[PDB]
Design a protein around this nucleic acid. Structure first.
Ligand SMILES: O=P(O)(O)O[C@H]1[C@H](OP(=O)(O)O)[C@H](OP(=O)(O)O)[C@H](OP(=O)(O)O)[C@@H](OP(=O)(O)O)[C@H]1OP(=O)(O)O
Lengths: 182, 230, 18, 162, 73, 176, 123, 35, 138, 56
RNA sequence: CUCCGAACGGUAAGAGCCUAGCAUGUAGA
RNA sequence: UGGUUUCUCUUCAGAUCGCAUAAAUCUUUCGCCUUUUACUAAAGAUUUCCGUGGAGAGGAACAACUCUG
RNA sequence: GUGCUCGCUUCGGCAGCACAUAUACUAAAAUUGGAACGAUACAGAGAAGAUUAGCAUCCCCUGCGCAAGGAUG
């Protein structure tokens, strides 16, 4: 099933970040279940200089955080609220909050060109959905417009991240004028 | 079968359950992650139906799960599937006004996934977005327009069983156009002709003169704009 | 001194084990 | 870097059969003879054998002229400390080698008593060696280099007994 | 209304607009609404000065733009 | 000293038995005054001695995360990982009201789904009271049936998250 | 207070039995609310009976940005608790929106050497 | 072209037999003429 | 367990209802077994052993006893009661008591051959109590 | 500061003074960290009976 | 009118003592 | 004349191969600029990825139902 | 193990024929050796400089680098 396939990747995606920090030999941070980074001891004397990652580790955490919210929305469908607006309004906000609240800006800024594209598709649907007696109530937001932009975001990052985070996973086992004319 | 549920069960053991000499390959083979994350978002459960199966090309250590199926629903069948799902959501707000939305983080940041609960729960609401099609006008689209497995592997008036070029009939697409008419704006090829045709925006970009409403004021191609002589 | 042969691996492994 | 095509091993470690099977893993296993990856050539010596592989490097074993697995010698069989001492290699040699060079490892569950594998246990459920003797206290460079070689020490001492 | 920017480490940096007379318990509810954690498990800190749960923002003189180092308990 | 009190005995449902509470709560509880005086030595008989002396039911309190001895004895029991008979002995013993509450936290965290509903169901009939440390450090009165119903409620216990395999309705269709 | 404790334990267990009975009845009431709303749209009244209002958990009280105030979003992470801290109508000048930004000569969006976006939002 | 394609495939990836035992084959496991 | 079709299965399914339920409850209890005791791949051995008995029950009811209908046979293979590839390998005369479908794969072995599961004891060696690590048994 | 008896040292912290006694080089064969669980029915139930008898 | 930014350029510098989450899976007799 | 399918591997794709559409690089341009990367989009051509099209090769399912002629 | 022999020939079985031919860095292991710039106590960046500068002719760490930065002979 897809829900079992979704929880298999999210358990494997979190198991990457636990082993990558354990291979980093920094046993004071703790990656959360929501694919965030949460320090424990709150120590910042000189350990903050070794905890600052690059633009590939945080982008790898941001993709798996958006991938879990698509997976856990169907997990809440199986148990909690269902059959009316679980996959509809849940993936509405998953298209909305990915540019608004969830997600990450620090990796790339060309994602904001797709955020403002996905936000423009929100105003495209709403004024063609609230034309009748709907009016102003928050409603469906069906996962076809906002799903299309972020599926193409991972379609461009999948050739990218193998070159971005390809060298990051490789360093753990390989080990890293006019005077010329005169 | 159920072989993947056992292999992923041994995750963080003390070098005695898939952790002795396999932990180095477990973090290295999983470095091909976003290709798997692309195939999760490509094989969506298509919320006009309920949860359906999908193939999986996993790894023996359990560091990957590749959903190796490409979604190939038929283009008229895909339009009325979202067309009937659009009407039932639009009719949902006109009947129900409560907005019982969900908390957008479904769980706290301390919970394991625990996929054995959702594996066999014997509870799955199939009545989600499936519109009640009456057997008077929707007779040729009764069973074909309700699931994703006959949407690509119908094998009745055979359409290339592994999602190939599909052939339909004349009343099959005629009942299709009735459901798609609620979400369509096709009248003629002359509404968007003079100020919204795709060839008309090339004159809007090359001459650097915006159409009142069409483009978003793209800048000029060259540098000399105006004021060559007073 | 290496000296390869173009014999079949199936009949060679069956005859030596017998 | 460090490549190879065929293992320079002894006839004792090659197996007690004319037909064998090799498995080549290019640039792996971290050969400690030269701290460089070599072609790890695994094979099966026979029925109820150890099924070991290559441990030393390719170019590092060429100057010593020893086996790839046993790492004793090329023709006689004495260690490198006994070969560099001295024909002396004619009398210290011994044909028809023992099966202990190709014997598998011992079962740790049998030494602990809880040997739950049973008769299908691939390890040897026998008594281990005596740790008081220096023959079970060698090292990596202690067997390759002639310095601190307990096997070469008893080979020169037992040669003059009668 | 001050715009306190709860800028923690590792990318978690959000803006939280709160009233001047608003208590710190109302600020953690607004900080959790932009970060995505439980508001009871958030401990704000400024060089080992763990803030309380009952003191208003007007008592700490936290003006507009006064950023805070967020931590999780 | 702090990894695991058993070398290889058993395992938790999804991870190590020591990594069952949150990592932010486990790091602060590992450096504590009540923990450092107890983690130097703790046996099966010694676990019954320290649990009977303490009368408190709560988790962290104060600005810094100061763990209660109820959560400190819960982590020392999870690191020791006793047998199921010793955990059933601590739940059925009426020698102290906090002793049965200490066994219930180890039952709902590491026990099976069928064993959790079977053991916590006789605990719902207890009408005794207990003292609970609040968030501000003050004590609050909580009934024994109020704490037992909170363990069968949603996952909101003091530094505890472990859902069952199903609910009470889904388990009723399969078994009693 | 042994007799008073047995009364309160019977009071909590009766409410717990009422909570478990209403939990299974919540699945029946969800199908009953779907059956009542379907008959209400079908043959109850043609736009003559609504019997409801505009019940939304968090309030939609908003205002207006003066000239260039930032789009401050409340954050879509907790929308079901309906706490009093959310309904505050976040349209206040926080740090730099207190100016009128019309007396200023041509435009001042961000003077921090990072103006990638070139927009004023009139087109 | 085949030799350059083998070097290009080796660059893009990174970025039976019978040996006659003439060393010590006299009597130990005799009869091994090809090995 | 959910049938995942909701399409009114025909007659004969009630005749094979408690038999397939006992095999499904055995595999679910084997899937909930901990990783203790098994060495490295011995925990996957009852997963294939319960799967081998589940495929043998449907194949004997269809080919050997021939009591189940073909409409209930196609509904059982679609719902997941037995693998279609496991019934296809048993149709050939060369393999009728194969251990697992992973042992019949030619590309699985490093030497490029079959396993010890697909080998008779009379053609094998004398002293051998070996078991297939990938398949599970002989 | 503190004063270690068996370790023969002097620490300043409270947990470090306990860790220098148990968990050091001198504490190898003096009560090491490898503990042992007791009997679930014999030693465990007798400790619950001895705690009830000493209290009452 | 609603276009919402992230990191580096940043906490030093040292003396004596104290305790930890880590890793390899060998040939040999 | 005689085979509906399905999975593996070998070429060219100048057809909206894609009735829809991502990222990176190179050569020129603008805006900020304060060290740099993350930046804004106008032009052109080079890869990677999401995919696909005819035509020979090898397995499985009724290939036999007898399809066109 | 599966199917068959105008086999012995009973139909209890036996013998032969045809297919199936070498998985397993082998264990639930044995040990082997230790690393926070992390807390605590001690003193607290000098309250003071006369060569005037760069370019190319050997390596670790931060970083994803065909940007970049510290140390270098
Ligand atoms: O951020 P905006 O682009 O402005 O969109 C606003 C809301 O976004 P959020 O505040 O982030 O939730 C959105 O709710 P959502 O679907 O995203 O959940 C809708 O409000 P509602 O809930 O449906 O009523 C919008 O339209 P209205 O329906 O007319 O209000 C509203 O626009 P407005 O602010 O100009 O009115």
């Amino acid at each position: 099933d897809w829900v079992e396939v979704g929880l298999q990747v999210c358990r494997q995606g979190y198991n990457m970040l636990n082993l990558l920090i354990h291979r980093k030999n920094l046993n004071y941070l703790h990656l959360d279940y929501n694919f965030n980074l949460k320090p424990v001891k709150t120590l910042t004397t000189k350990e903050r200089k070794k905890s600052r990652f690059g633009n590939a580790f945080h982008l790898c955490r941001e993709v798996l955080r958006l991938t879990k919210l698509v997976v856990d929305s169907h997990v809440q469908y199986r148990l909690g609220n269902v059959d009316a607006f679980q996959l509809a309004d849940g993936l509405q906000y998953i298209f909305a909050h990915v540019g608004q609240l969830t997600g990450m800006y620090r990796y790339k800024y060309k994602l904001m060109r797709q955020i403002r594209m996905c936000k423009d598709l929100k105003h495209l649907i709403y004024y063609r959905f609230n034309t009748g007696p709907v009016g102003k109530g928050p409603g469906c937001g069906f996962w076809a417009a906002g799903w299309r932009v972020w599926l193409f975001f991972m379609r461009g990052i999948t050739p990218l991240l193998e070159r971005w985070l390809g060298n990051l996973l490789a360093r753990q086992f390989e080990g890293r004028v006019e005077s010329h004319f005169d | 079968p159920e072989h993947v549920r056992k292999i992923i069960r041994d995750h963080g053991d003390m070098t005695n359950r898939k952790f002795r000499h396999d932990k180095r390959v477990y973090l290295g083979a999983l470095k091909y992650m976003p290709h798997a994350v692309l195939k999760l978002l490509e094989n969506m459960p298509m919320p006009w139906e309920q949860i359906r199966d999908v193939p999986v090309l996993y790894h023996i250590t359990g560091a990957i799960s590749f959903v190796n199926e490409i979604p190939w629903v038929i283009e008229p069948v895909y339009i009325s599937q979202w067309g009937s799902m659009w009407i039932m959501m639009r009719r949902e707000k006109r009947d129900r006004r409560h907005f019982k939305r969900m908390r957008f983080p479904p769980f706290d940041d301390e919970e394991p996934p625990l996929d054995y609960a959702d594996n066999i729960l014997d509870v799955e609401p199939l009545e989600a977005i499936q519109l009640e099609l009456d057997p008077e006008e929707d007779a040729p689209v009764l069973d074909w327009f309700y699931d994703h497995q006959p949407l690509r592997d119908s094998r009745k008036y055979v359409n290339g069983s592994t999602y190939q070029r599909w052939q339909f009939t004349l009343p099959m697409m005629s009942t299709l156009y009735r459901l798609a008419n609620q979400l369509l704006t096709d009248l003629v090829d002359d509404n968007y002709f003079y100020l919204f045709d795709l060839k008309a925006f090339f004159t809007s970009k090359a001459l650097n003169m915006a159409i009142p409403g069409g483009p978003k004021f793209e800048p000029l191609v060259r540098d000399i704009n105006l004021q060559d002589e007073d | 001194y290496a000296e390869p042969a173009h014999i079949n691996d199936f009949m060679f492994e069956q005859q030596r084990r017998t | 870097w460090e490549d190879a095509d065929f293992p320079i091993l002894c006839q004792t470690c090659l197996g007690e059969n004319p037909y064998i099977r090799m498995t080549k893993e290019k640039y792996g296993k971290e050969c400690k003879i030269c701290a460089r990856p070599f072609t790890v050539f695994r094979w099966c010596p026979g029925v109820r054998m150890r099924f070991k592989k290559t441990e030393v490097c390719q170019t590092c074993s060429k100057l010593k002229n020893v086996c790839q697995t046993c790492l004793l010698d090329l023709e006689y069989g004495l260690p490198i400390q006994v070969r560099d001492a001295g024909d002396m290699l004619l009398k210290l040699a011994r044909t028809t080698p023992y099966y202990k060079r190709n014997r598998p490892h011992i079962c740790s569950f049998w030494v602990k008593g809880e040997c739950k594998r049973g008769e299908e246990c691939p390890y040897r459920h026998e008594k281990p060696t005596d740790p008081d003797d220096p023959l079970a206290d060698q090292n990596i460079k202690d067997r390759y280099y002639g310095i601190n070689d307990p096997v070469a020490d008893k080979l020169l001492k037992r040669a003059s007994t009668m | 209304m001050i715009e306190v920017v709860c800028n923690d480490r590792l990318g978690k940096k959000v803006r939280v607009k709160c009233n001047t007379d608003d208590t710190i318990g109302d600020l953690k509810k607004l900080i959790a609404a932009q970060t995505g954690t439980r508001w009871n498990k958030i401990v704000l800190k400024k060089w080992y000065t763990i803030f309380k749960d009952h003191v208003s923002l007007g008592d700490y003189e936290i003006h507009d733009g006064m950023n805070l180092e967020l931590y999780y308990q | 000293m702090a990894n695991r009190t058993v070398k290889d005995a058993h395992s938790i449902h999804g991870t190590n038995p020591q990594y069952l509470v949150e990592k932010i709560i486990r790091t602060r509880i590992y450096e504590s005054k009540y923990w450092k005086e107890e983690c130097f030595g703790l046996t099966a008989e010694l676990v019954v001695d320290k649990a009977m002396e303490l009368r408190f039911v709560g988790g962290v309190y104060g600005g810094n995360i100061k763990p209660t001895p109820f959560l400190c004895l819960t982590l020392k029991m999870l690191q020791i990982q006793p047998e199921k008979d010793i955990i059933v002995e601590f739940i059925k013993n009426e020698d102290f009201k906090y002793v049965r509450m200490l066994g219930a936290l180890y039952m709902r965290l590491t026990g099976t789904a069928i064993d959790c509903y079977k053991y916590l169901e006789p605990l719902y009939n207890d009408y005794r009271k207990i003292k609970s440390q609040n968030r501000n450090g003050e004590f609050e009165l909580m009934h024994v049936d109020e704490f037992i119903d909170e363990l069968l409620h949603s996952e909101r216990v003091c530094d505890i998250i472990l859902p069952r395999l199903q609910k009470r309705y889904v388990l009723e269709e399969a078994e009693q | 207070n042994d007799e008073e404790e047995y009364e309160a334990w019977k009071v909590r267990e009766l409410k717990r039995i009422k909570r478990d009975r209403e939990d299974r009845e919540a699945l029946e009431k969800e199908k009953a609310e779907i059956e009542r709303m379907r008959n209400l749209t079908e043959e109850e009244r043609r736009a003559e009976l609504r019997a409801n209002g505009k019940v939304i958990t968090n309030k939609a009280v908003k205002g207006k940005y003066k000239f260039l105030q930032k789009y401050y979003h409340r954050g879509a992470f907790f929308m079901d608790e309906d706490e009093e801290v959310y309904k505050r109508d976040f349209s206040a000048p926080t740090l730099e929106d207190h100016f009128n930004k019309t007396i200023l000569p041509k435009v001042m969006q961000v003077k921090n050497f990072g103006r990638s976006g070139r927009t004023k939002y009139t087109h | 072209r085949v030799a350059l394609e083998k070097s290009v495939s080796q660059k893009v990836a990174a970025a039976y037999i019978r040996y006659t035992p003439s060393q010590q084959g006299v009597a130990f496991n005799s009869g091994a003429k090809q090995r | 367990k959910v049938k995942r079709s909701r399409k009114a299965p025909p007659d004969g399914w009630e005749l094979i209802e408690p038999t397939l339920d006992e095999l499904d409850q055995k595999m679910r209890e084997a899937e909930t077994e901990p990783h203790e005791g098994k060495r490295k791949v011995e925990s996957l051995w009852p997963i294939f052993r319960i799967h081998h008995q589940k495929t043998r029950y449907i194949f004997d009811l269809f080919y050997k006893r021939k009591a189940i209908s073909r409409e209930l046979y196609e509904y059982c293979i679609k719902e997941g009661y037995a693998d279609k590839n496991l019934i296809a390998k048993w149709k050939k005369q060369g393999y009728e008591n194969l251990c697992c479908l992973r042992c019949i794969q030619t590309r699985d072995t490093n030497f490029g051959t079959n396993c010890i599961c697909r080998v008779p004891k009379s053609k094998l060696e004398v002293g051998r109590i070996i078991e297939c690590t990938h398949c599970g048994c002989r | 500061g503190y004063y270690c008896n068996v370790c023969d040292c002097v620490v300043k912290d409270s947990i470090n003074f306990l860790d220098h006694i148990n968990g050091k080089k001198h504490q190898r064969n003096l009560g090491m960290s490898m503990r042992v669980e007791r009997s679930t029915l014999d030693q465990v139930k007798k400790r619950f009976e001895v705690n009830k008898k000493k209290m009452e």
